[PDB]
Amino acid sequence: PSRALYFSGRGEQLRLRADLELPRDAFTLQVWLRAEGGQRSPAVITGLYDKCSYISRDRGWVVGIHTISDQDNKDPRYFFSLKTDRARQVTTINAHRSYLPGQWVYLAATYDGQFMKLYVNGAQVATSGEQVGGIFSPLTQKCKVLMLGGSALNHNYRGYIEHFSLWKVARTQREILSDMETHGA
Amino acid sequence: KGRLSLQNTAEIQHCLVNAGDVGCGVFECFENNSCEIRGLHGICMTFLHNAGKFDAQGKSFIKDALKCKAHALRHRFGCISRKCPAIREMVSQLQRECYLKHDLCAAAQENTRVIVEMIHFKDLLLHEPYVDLVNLLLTCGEEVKEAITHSVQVQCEQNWGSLCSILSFCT
Amino acid sequence: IRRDDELIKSQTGPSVTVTCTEGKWNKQVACEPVDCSIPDHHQVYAASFSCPEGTTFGSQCSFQCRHPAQLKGNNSLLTCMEDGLWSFPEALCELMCLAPPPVPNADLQTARCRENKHKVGSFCKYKCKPGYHVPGSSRKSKKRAFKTQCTQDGSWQEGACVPVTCDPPPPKFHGLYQCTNGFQFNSECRIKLGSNVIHCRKDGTWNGSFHVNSNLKLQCPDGYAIGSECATSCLDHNSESIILPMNVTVRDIPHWLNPTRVERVVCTAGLKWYPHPALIHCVKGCEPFMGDNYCDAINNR
């Protein structure tokens, strides 16, 4: 049948093995998730982090749940952050509504090379065009790591993760809806 | 003006629980309130301003008295009826039971000239804890009482000539 | 765009529309090149950037690594692309620490530490030789191993094995003692049967012992005889006696100095001169204001 992982706040987090090449030019993340009620503020779900650098460790891309108002942590929304090696400023993409703590959400994040888009439950929510080019050089391909359910600074996630899907190319909205209706088959 | 509701108790409670009990931060928080209990912050500042004139016993007494007063003000401010006479009663009671238990008379008999010449006539009249400290201090020694009455007569010759000319001699 | 005469403005995008009006064009347009930022960090770590042309479109900049850093790659140029950002560096300054300097009186337990190729974060375990130890421990506990690592600069952390200082002689024949090496290793101490030579070995063990004021007041029971500890105290309890034999008075002590505590004057052979009452001075002692969350300017020393 279908089985899912339950990520708790105690520090349970996974790590992708290095045998699979990380995407460089364009990528598409498709994840069925069920978020719990109270998450932490910078809490992440899936990230692409840097482990051999010390000047700037906030490169790559990271999808998660965070509050748009840092001074009050009032309403938490899904967010997609991206900072390529060529760029100098990390630009974040938010959702349009506060997340439902008891419903399945099919979260998708796309980046093609000019525009990054965020699909919450099949509908395009936000699209930013400040990140350009690839995300990292192919020389540092082995240094980048992919983390699921948490970060190196113990940004734990509480919820369910059902069907993980990461693509090596950018996909349009019709392919996103087709992958939604076909599930993991 | 008979209730401490004019100034929110939440902000002064946050100020009390945020600051430390070592310095005058608690008296810095408590000095701005609805009831006129102003004067504790002045005592905390002036005791820590002329602390070099005291000896080691006097400085230890100053540290213990300010520590006990800060711990008592953070301690017994929890459940208390919100009215100015009750606040005055609990402030005077904590000041009295803190100064009596740390041998104020011993520090008076150590060095009384600093403790009776550094007082100010201005703001003594309108501050109740200053009057409490004065009327508790003179019961220690007769020479200290004579010195503080001499200071009061000097301040009468400085500021208010009414009570100098009227009943200079008692009987 | 520098507009001159216009009524309404329309966001055409990458292009623009210029209209002729009364013998002059309405706008002054200029396609300036994109300006990449000056490369300081965030592209190549630990390298020097010196662009021979500039930081405009089509300009190429040259970076060179630091002397510890190595360089692998066919091209060592950065191109300011059309996106307004510099391109990906095809060559990276890989940071590799060189061979460590030879620490004296140490044994290299790790066989790879004697090479020259070492990555940042390598750990070398250095074992102190007998008669030597890593500083940080007293004469009771013996520690003879330490770890050294490559730092982010490209140089190893400092560490050396100091000689084991021998135990002090007893004060019965101290002051007239004449050691061959003093407090260093292999110190043979003999004053001018029993143990005529004292061998300070590698473990620092003593094989055999030696064989045959107006302000400061002392009250010994024996008096001028030997074997009695004298209660040495100042006239006031507020002052503390210290031993300052190197011509230091009460007011000559700096704030960073650590004077020794007052030792009870035990009578040695002959006159008791090794502790001298005129040399011991009563200075402003400490007061019980420790751990009270208050800084004391008098006791700030």
- Give the amino acid at A61: W
* Interchain contact A/B (3 or more Cβ pairs less than 8 Å): no
Q: CB C85 to CB A132 under 8 A? A: yes
Q: Which two three-digit tokens encode residue B1?
A: 């003006």
Q: CB C289 to CB B63 under 8 A? A: yes
Beta strands in C32-121 (DSSP E): 47-50, 60-65, 77-79, 96-97, 106-108, 118-119
- Angle (nearest 5°) at CA A42 between A25 and A54: 60
Tokens 């300017």 sit on residue: C297
Q: Which residue of C has its CA nearest to B59?
A: C289
Instruction: Report chain A residues whose CB lies below 8 A from the CB of C81.
Output: 86, 133
Mention every residue, 6+ apart, whose C-beta is less than 8 A from residue A172: none
Experimental method: cryo-EM
Q: CB A85 to CB C83 under 8 A? A: no
Distance CA C268, CA B103 (A): 49
Neighbours of chain A (3+ CB pairs under 8 A): C
Q: Which of C167, C229, C140, C265 is nearest to C177 (CA)?
A: C167
* Interchain contact C/A (3 or more Cβ pairs less than 8 Å): yes
- Contact status, residue A82 vs residue A110, Cβ threshold 8 Å: no
Distance CA C149, CA C250 (A): 45
The dihedrals phi and psi of A29, each to the nearest 5 degrees, come to -105, 125
Q: CB C289 to CB B22 under 8 A? A: no
Query: CB-side exposure of A108: number of CA atoms within 13 Å?
Result: 25
Backbone φ/ψ region at B43: left (φ over 0), alpha (ψ -120 to 50), beta: alpha
- Contact status, residue C289 vs residue C300, Cβ threshold 8 Å: no
What does chain A come to in residues?
Answer: 185
Residue of C42, C45, C89 lying closest to A88 (CB–CB): C42
- Contact status, residue A108 vs residue A30, Cβ threshold 8 Å: yes
Q: Which residue of B has its CA nearest to C293?
A: B22
When computed from its CA atoms, the radius of gyration of chain A, rounded to whole angstroms, is 16
Please report which residue ranges of chain A form alpha helices under DSSP H.
173-182
Distance CA C145, CA C214 (A): 51
- Contact status, residue B156 vs residue B163, Cβ threshold 8 Å: yes
Shortest CA gap A65–chain C (Å)? 27
Determine contact: C205 vs chain A, CB below 8 A: no
Q: Which two three-digit tokens encode residue C159?
A: 């560490």
Q: Which long-range contacts (CB under 8 A, 24 or more apart) does B15-24 make?
A: B16/B73, B16/B74, B16/B77, B17/B74, B20/C293, B21/B67, B21/B70, B21/B71, B21/B74, B22/B67, B22/B70, B22/C292, B22/C293, B22/C294, B24/B48, B24/B66
Distance CA C213, CA C234 (A): 9
DSSP B93: H
Q: In angstroms, what is the resolution?
A: 4.2
Q: Which two three-digit tokens encode residue C230?
A: 């004298």
Tokens 């510099």 sit on residue: C86
